[PDB]
Amino acid sequence: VSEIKTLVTFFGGTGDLAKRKLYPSVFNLYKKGYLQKHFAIVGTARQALNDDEFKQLVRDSIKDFTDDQAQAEAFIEHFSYRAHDVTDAASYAVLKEAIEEAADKFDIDGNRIFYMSVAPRFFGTIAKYLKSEGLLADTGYNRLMIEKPFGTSYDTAAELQNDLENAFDDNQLFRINHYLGKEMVQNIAALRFGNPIFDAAWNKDYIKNVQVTLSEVLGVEERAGYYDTAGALLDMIQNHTMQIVGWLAMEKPESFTDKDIRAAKNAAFNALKIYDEAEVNKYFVRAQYGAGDSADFKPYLEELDVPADSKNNTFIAGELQFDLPRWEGVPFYVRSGKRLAAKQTRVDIVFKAGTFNFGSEQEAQEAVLSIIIDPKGAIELKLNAKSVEDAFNTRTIDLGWTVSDEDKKNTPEPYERMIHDTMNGDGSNFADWNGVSIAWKFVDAISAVYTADKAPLETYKSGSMGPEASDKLLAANGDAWVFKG
Amino acid sequence: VSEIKTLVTFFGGTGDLAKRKLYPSVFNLYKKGYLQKHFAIVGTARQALNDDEFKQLVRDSIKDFTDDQAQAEAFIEHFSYRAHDVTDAASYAVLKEAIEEAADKFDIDGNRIFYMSVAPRFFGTIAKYLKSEGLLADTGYNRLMIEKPFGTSYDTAAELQNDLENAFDDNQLFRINHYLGKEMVQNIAALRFGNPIFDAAWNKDYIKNVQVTLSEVLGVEERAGYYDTAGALLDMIQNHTMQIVGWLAMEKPESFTDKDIRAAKNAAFNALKIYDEAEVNKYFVRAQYGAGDSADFKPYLEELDVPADSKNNTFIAGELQFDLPRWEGVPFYVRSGKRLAAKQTRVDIVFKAGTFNFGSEQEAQEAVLSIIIDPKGAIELKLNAKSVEDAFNTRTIDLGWTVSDEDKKNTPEPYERMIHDTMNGDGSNFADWNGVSIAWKFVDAISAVYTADKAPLETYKSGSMGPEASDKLLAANGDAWVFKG
Ligand SMILES: [Ca+2]
Ligand SMILES: [Ca+2]
């Protein structure tokens, strides 16, 4: 294939994430023939290691992904290490050499990517020094991959953005987002813009309401520590839900270039309504899971590392409003939670029921277009048809499709996609500042009410699909959740 | 259920069709609880028979449809016979008595249906005498069921219509049509008008071309005699194909009453273009099957009762044009033949490919909505989506649905539906004079050229889907047959 000439530097190269997902993902790119000769991978972290040790660690990383050990070895040849502390300005000069050495060794003309697989606290610092100690390629591109999370509020995120903008331009910042880089999520645009019947129907005239669902069966388990101060709101809503919504609510772009796609999404985000106390109580529902029908389904407050006085949300459901002509009056329902009926990630576009009366006992109903993202990719379409009865009558039928085993094999894992995207400079599947900022502004307004405790905290049974209030949220507009569990 | 009070008279009651399909269909209506007490069935034909003989014949008819002999017997009690010759005006007075007797015996206030399961030659006569010898109910309704065919040309059909109109009004004439009374064909309206995304897309703006296919695997077998002078053109095209097209090309009715539905269909039929010699050669293809890859797949000319000099068509494919704003420039391709790939009856609505460019190697393609009528009812929808590849690209995926075993059981057979329709007075699933006349005018113009032999007769391999010219017919508008075999 067309070879990719790039030099990647992994800050936090000794970390679990690197050897657990990053390195294997980069290996696949080698196997697929993308990375061939003109490329290098410079690992870095505080822990001192001689090349042999690092290369072995990499060897352990790509173990289960190896078939021909010789091919793997030829790959490992492209790795190098350098002990380094991120707070030491002078210490950076060591790294500059490592990078410029590897560059020479394989004749790589710039094209540098810096993957910060380190704690949030070091993002701004590392960025600042890459610029100061002339680590940025004087030719070719320079791109930065910011691991999650990007801020914990609007202000912290704005701060982070400021620090990064002192060394990079926004179109060079590639923020990691799991669900945005998922095969099915990218289908949305194709379904919509690729089929005129849907494209022309993507608006208020045909759509009754849109639904996004991020359901998880598991509970908090051990993530209690950080989860207790983040909850579903920041963990699932602010990032995954919000960006998926972006693909759905976007206008029709002038073309499919990441630039036009982004401008299109932003048009929507800029129209999103930010709520006040009263509105958050009306359009949103915050809940925490209680006990299930068994003992092992312990209430949230009985989970390890969870404070008894906690009023943290293990579930969030709310209505989004877009002040755009296209979505005038079209509700966007979102929900994400733990200890729910089943692991499911899906989007349900509910179309308005036709007004043509057949005189049947059962008149026309609402058609539903459904995109199943997790676990198995699927696309369903509930249509109106004639029931098999003596008298003329209508009913709904489900037209369905599922990914094949072949599609299931050739599908690239998230990290490999994101990393590969960055190498090509494809920001299409990435959140930009405008989107991230709005998402934060939006969530910030909600968090305010929750921290202040000026909103009730519902409770629900472990195994259900949430609190009753969730269903009542939609019933208020005469709607209902398509996915029932 | 709401009991049906009716009195049916079967002309040609001793015929194969009556005891083979008619009577069982009427039995089912009894089993389903529609016909209960106030109903009677008067059989009639030349062959003299005493009640016992007739009732036994009926008993033999509904044999394989009986479970509880006692229930069947209670039904047979409602039958009566009367020997009769249709050309004898006086002989009709005998029948008037039989009818008025049965009416009294079960207290049936009019509501008479006269099923002419006799040769075409007797249709006008029987009709004339039903009026003359006061056989028509002085109260309640009077309906007539005309078995196939309704004329063999426009003129013969107009003649028939005239004779019948001397005794009945058009809305009382229920012409039998197999494919029109098929479960799947009735779904069309539901799919279209029940789902706004399709309703609003049912026109030139979204549709590229429409395709109707009546494929049969079998050859002529023994039907050679009458088939040689009828061919596919009159056998499948003029009646089945033409009326199905009607459901597809109709405008949007003011309501779903048979009246409005009919006016809607007529608006289309009145816009259909009738061809001349040149046009028939351009927009239509006439063919006859040759040999297959085996001996038992004998050429049409080697079939029993087929004249060696025959230039009869065992296959017909053509383009229909509707001079209506809604179908301006939208081709309607129709095809029907014998010795083709497989038994199939389907409708393919091909939508225009979107013009939104993704920059992918494979840009958007044409979406296809498919309604499978025979054998197993199914509905498929080929949509545009994203292919599972590293680079962004589009592909087509098939969303599908199939009738369930339950839907397959509860589905009423054609004759039972038609007969039951007539009892309720539901002309929705019936062709009217305007439709029949236009279909005939349309086919007549074609037959003219064929009889005159001013059009070529193509040949094709038994087992294929027709002659090459068929594919070339569509290629000319940049189209292709969806069903490939
Ligand atoms: Ca509301
Ligand atoms: Ca043409």
UniProtKB/Swiss-Prot annotation, chains A, B:
Active site: 240
Binding-site residues for substrate, renumbered to this chain: 178, 182, 216, 235, 338, 343
Outcome when changing residue 182 to Q/R: Strongly decreases catalytic efficiency toward glucose 6-phosphate
Positions of NADP(+) binding: 12-19, 46, 85-86, 148
pH dependence, record text: Optimum pH is 5.4-8.9.
Keywords carried by this UniProt record: Carbohydrate metabolism, Glucose metabolism, NAD, NADP, Oxidoreductase
Outcome when changing residue 47 to A/E: Decreases catalytic efficiency toward glucose 6-phosphate
Consequence of changing residue 374 to Q: Strongly decreases catalytic efficiency toward glucose 6-phosphate
Effect of residue 178 to N: Strongly decreases catalytic efficiency toward glucose 6-phosphate
Family: Belongs to the glucose-6-phosphate dehydrogenase family.
UniProt name for this protein: Glucose-6-phosphate 1-dehydrogenase
Organism field: Leuconostoc mesenteroides
GN (gene name): zwf
